[PDB]
Amino acid sequence: FLQSDVFFLFLLPPIILDAGYFLPLRS
């Protein structure tokens, strides 16, 4: 597929890090 930004899933999955941004550092 190709629609979910693409650039995001490109470099790295913004699941955990992009989850809380700062929360992931203490999740």
mmCIF file of C-alpha atoms in Angstrom, residues 6-26:
data_model
loop_
_atom_site.group_PDB
_atom_site.id
_atom_site.type_symbol
_atom_site.label_atom_id
_atom_site.label_comp_id
_atom_site.label_asym_id
_atom_site.label_seq_id
_atom_site.Cartn_x
_atom_site.Cartn_y
_atom_site.Cartn_z
ATOM 1 C CA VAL A 6 5.024 6.700 3.607
ATOM 2 C CA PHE A 7 7.905 8.850 4.893
ATOM 3 C CA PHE A 8 7.018 7.796 8.435
ATOM 4 C CA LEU A 9 7.112 4.043 7.896
ATOM 5 C CA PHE A 10 10.094 4.897 5.722
ATOM 6 C CA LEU A 11 12.798 5.997 8.162
ATOM 7 C CA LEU A 12 11.327 4.300 11.223
ATOM 8 C CA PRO A 13 7.921 3.148 12.577
ATOM 9 C CA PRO A 14 6.367 6.042 14.583
ATOM 10 C CA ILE A 15 4.483 3.593 16.811
ATOM 11 C CA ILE A 16 6.233 3.644 20.195
ATOM 12 C CA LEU A 17 8.501 6.690 19.855
ATOM 13 C CA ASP A 18 5.827 8.716 18.090
ATOM 14 C CA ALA A 19 3.335 7.277 20.598
ATOM 15 C CA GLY A 20 3.854 9.601 23.536
ATOM 16 C CA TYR A 21 7.034 11.149 22.130
ATOM 17 C CA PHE A 22 8.385 11.611 25.653
ATOM 18 C CA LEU A 23 6.281 8.894 27.287
ATOM 19 C CA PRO A 24 8.137 6.096 25.403
ATOM 20 C CA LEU A 25 11.268 7.062 27.338
ATOM 21 C CA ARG A 26 9.411 6.002 30.485
#
